[PDB]
Design an enzyme around this catalytic site. Structure first.
Site, PDB file in Angstrom:
ATOM      1  N   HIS A   1       3.729  10.944   6.505  1.00 29.10           N
ATOM      2  CA  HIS A   1       3.107  10.641   7.790  1.00 29.10           C
ATOM      3  C   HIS A   1       4.160  10.012   8.705  1.00 29.10           C
ATOM      4  CE1 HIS A   1      -1.093  10.468   5.880  1.00 29.10           C
ATOM      5  NE2 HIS A   1      -0.676  11.719   6.141  1.00 29.10           N
TER       6      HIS A   1
ATOM      7  N   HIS B   1       0.865  -1.204   0.000  1.00 31.87           N
ATOM      8  CA  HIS B   1       0.000   0.000   0.000  1.00 31.87           C
ATOM      9  C   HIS B   1       0.889   1.238   0.000  1.00 31.87           C
ATOM     10  CE1 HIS B   1      -3.124  -2.770   1.119  1.00 31.87           C
ATOM     11  NE2 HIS B   1      -1.949  -3.262   1.913  1.00 31.87           N
TER      12      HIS B   1
ATOM     13  N   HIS C   1       5.812   6.879   6.471  1.00 35.45           N
ATOM     14  CA  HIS C   1       5.501   6.503   5.145  1.00 35.45           C
ATOM     15  C   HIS C   1       4.930   7.705   4.405  1.00 35.45           C
ATOM     16  CE1 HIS C   1       1.777   6.157   7.386  1.00 35.45           C
ATOM     17  NE2 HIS C   1       1.184   6.597   6.237  1.00 35.45           N
TER      18      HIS C   1
ATOM     19  N   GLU D   1      -3.294  13.490   1.142  1.00 30.42           N
ATOM     20  CA  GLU D   1      -4.537  13.025   1.780  1.00 30.42           C
ATOM     21  C   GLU D   1      -5.274  14.252   2.343  1.00 30.42           C
ATOM     22  OE1 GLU D   1      -3.469   9.469   4.158  1.00 30.42           O
ATOM     23  OE2 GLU D   1      -4.420   8.568   2.375  1.00 30.42           O
TER      24      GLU D   1
ATOM     25  N   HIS E   1       2.105   9.057   1.076  1.00 29.86           N
ATOM     26  CA  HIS E   1       1.043   8.862   0.117  1.00 29.86           C
ATOM     27  C   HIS E   1       1.354   9.782  -1.056  1.00 29.86           C
ATOM     28  CE1 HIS E   1      -1.463   6.883   3.253  1.00 29.86           C
ATOM     29  NE2 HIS E   1      -0.757   7.669   4.036  1.00 29.86           N
TER      30      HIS E   1
ATOM     31  N   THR F   1      -5.821   6.682   8.050  1.00 26.58           N
ATOM     32  CA  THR F   1      -6.384   6.947   6.701  1.00 26.58           C
ATOM     33  C   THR F   1      -6.396   5.714   5.824  1.00 26.58           C
ATOM     34  OG1 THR F   1      -4.333   7.538   5.653  1.00 26.58           O
ATOM     35  CG2 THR F   1      -5.510   9.317   6.778  1.00 26.58           C
ATOM     36  N   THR F   2      -5.990   4.576   6.348  1.00 27.06           N
ATOM     37  CA  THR F   2      -6.138   3.302   5.680  1.00 27.06           C
ATOM     38  C   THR F   2      -6.857   2.376   6.628  1.00 27.06           C
ATOM     39  OG1 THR F   2      -4.110   2.185   6.475  1.00 27.06           O
ATOM     40  CG2 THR F   2      -3.901   3.542   4.540  1.00 27.06           C
TER      41      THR F   2
HETATM   42  N1  LIG Z   1      -1.928   6.770   7.003  1.00 26.37           N
HETATM   43  S1  LIG Z   1      -1.885   6.824   8.574  1.00 26.37           S
HETATM   44  O1  LIG Z   1      -0.718   7.537   9.027  1.00 26.37           O
HETATM   45  O2  LIG Z   1      -3.165   7.273   9.104  1.00 26.37           O
HETATM   46  C1  LIG Z   1      -1.693   5.179   9.168  1.00 26.37           C
HETATM   47  C2  LIG Z   1      -0.764   4.904  10.159  1.00 26.37           C
HETATM   48  C3  LIG Z   1      -0.669   3.584  10.655  1.00 26.37           C
HETATM   49  C4  LIG Z   1      -1.523   2.608  10.216  1.00 26.37           C
HETATM   50  N2  LIG Z   1      -1.344   1.320  10.578  1.00 26.37           N
HETATM   51  C5  LIG Z   1      -0.469   0.691  10.822  1.00 26.37           C
HETATM   52  S2  LIG Z   1      -0.938  -0.943  11.168  1.00 26.37           S
HETATM   53  O3  LIG Z   1       0.903   1.027  10.890  1.00 26.37           O
HETATM   54  C6  LIG Z   1       1.736  -0.130  11.374  1.00 26.37           C
HETATM   55  C7  LIG Z   1       3.178   0.488  11.345  1.00 26.37           C
HETATM   56  C8  LIG Z   1       4.179  -0.546  11.863  1.00 26.37           C
HETATM   57  C9  LIG Z   1       3.904  -1.691  12.654  1.00 26.37           C
HETATM   58  C10 LIG Z   1       5.137  -2.419  12.914  1.00 26.37           C
HETATM   59  S3  LIG Z   1       6.535  -1.406  12.636  1.00 26.37           S
HETATM   60  C11 LIG Z   1       5.596  -0.496  11.512  1.00 26.37           C
HETATM   61  C12 LIG Z   1      -2.412   2.875   9.141  1.00 26.37           C
HETATM   62  C13 LIG Z   1      -2.505   4.183   8.655  1.00 26.37           C
HETATM   63 ZN   LIG Z   2      -0.483   7.622   6.032  1.00 28.18          ZN
END
Ligand SMILES: NS(=O)(=O)c1ccc(NC(=S)OCCc2ccsc2)cc1
Ligand SMILES: [Zn+2]
Length: 258
Positions: A117, A62, A92, A104, A94, A196-197
């Site tokens: 993010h 993703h 990460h 986003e 987007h 947001t995912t």
């Molecule tokens: N796009 S967002 O920043 O809202 C966002 C952040 C985290 C998540 N979820 C997750 S599960 O992040 C896991 C990150 C991780 C776990 C082990 S080390 C890296 C989904 C969306």
């Molecule tokens: Zn994000």
């Protein structure tokens, strides 16, 4: 049939497996800068990343995540709207297929080319997994990217993406310093929202910086060469991995600056 960003599995479908997609505090949102209000109750924001320890970079199908060792109190976010200390676990991005889209959050309906993010969890909950069962479990620092001058501090990320082209690939990624991804100013907007995912959990205090960073066209073109698919599967470029703005509902966006 797993969620994604395509016609048959993208944001308009997520609600069937994740009904909170239609919740009361979903993200991202449009930030209407004239309606946002300065909040004198915000304390100074502190982004303390000097002892950050990155570990690895992963293509999760993703986006790509730069992961940090969050076993010690090291890279932390505090202040601003936050109560107590939030520890960096990953960042990460987007981004779009074209420079005119990819963020986003939007600012007066303007879409940036990408959005970074930096994801943090509230240390009062012990770990990330328990933090995502709490309404104040997470804090995400969002930073817009526009295309212009290169961001030198991003190049080490760009240069490793050829090693993680497809879903499931990871690479060692130690010693990367996320300070080199920040703009000069920490002026920001903040509001309560969600991931947001999927799973779209409503755990996030969003802190969105007003000042974008500039990255070069060549840097973002390398993001767009990543793949959503796995090795040996038909190529689907990892582009347009953004959720559009969601209804603001009963929220106010607060500004840190007058
Ligand atoms: N796009 S967002 O920043 O809202 C966002 C952040 C985290 C998540 N979820 C997750 S599960 O992040 C896991 C990150 C991780 C776990 C082990 S080390 C890296 C989904 C969306
Ligand atoms: Zn994000």
């Amino acid at each position: 049939h797993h969620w994604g960003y395509g016609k048959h599995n993208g944001p308009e479908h997520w609600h069937k497996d994740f009904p909170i997609a239609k919740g009361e505090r979903q993200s991202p949102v449009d930030i209407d800068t004239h309606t946002a209000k300065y909040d004198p109750s915000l304390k100074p924001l502190s982004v303390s990343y000097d002892q950050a320890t990155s570990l690895r970079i992963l293509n999760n199908g993703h986006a790509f995540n730069v992961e940090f060792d969050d076993s010690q109190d090291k890279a932390v976010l505090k202040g601003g709207p936050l109560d107590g200390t939030y520890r960096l676990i990953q960042f990460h991005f987007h981004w779009g297929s074209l420079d005119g889209q990819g963020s986003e959050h939007t600012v007066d309906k303007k879409k940036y080319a990408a959005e970074l993010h930096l994801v943090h969890w509230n240390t009062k909950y012990g770990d990330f997994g328990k933090a995502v069962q709490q309404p104040d479990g997470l804090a995400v620092l969002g930073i817009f990217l526009k295309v212009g001058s290169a961001k030198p501090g991003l190049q080490k990320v760009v240069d490793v993406l050829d090693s993680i082209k497809t879903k499931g690939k990871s690479a060692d990624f130690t010693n990367f310093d996320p300070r080199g991804l920040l703009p000069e100013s920490l002026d920001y907007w903040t509001y309560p929202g969600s991931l947001t995912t999927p799973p779209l959990l409503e755990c996030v205090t969003w802190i969105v910086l007003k000042e974008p960073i500039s990255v070069s066209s060549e840097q973002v073109l390398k993001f767009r060469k990543l793949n959503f698919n796995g090795e040996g599967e038909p190529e689907e470029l990892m582009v347009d991995n953004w959720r559009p703005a969601q209804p603001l509902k009963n929220r106010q966006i607060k500004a840190s600056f007058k």
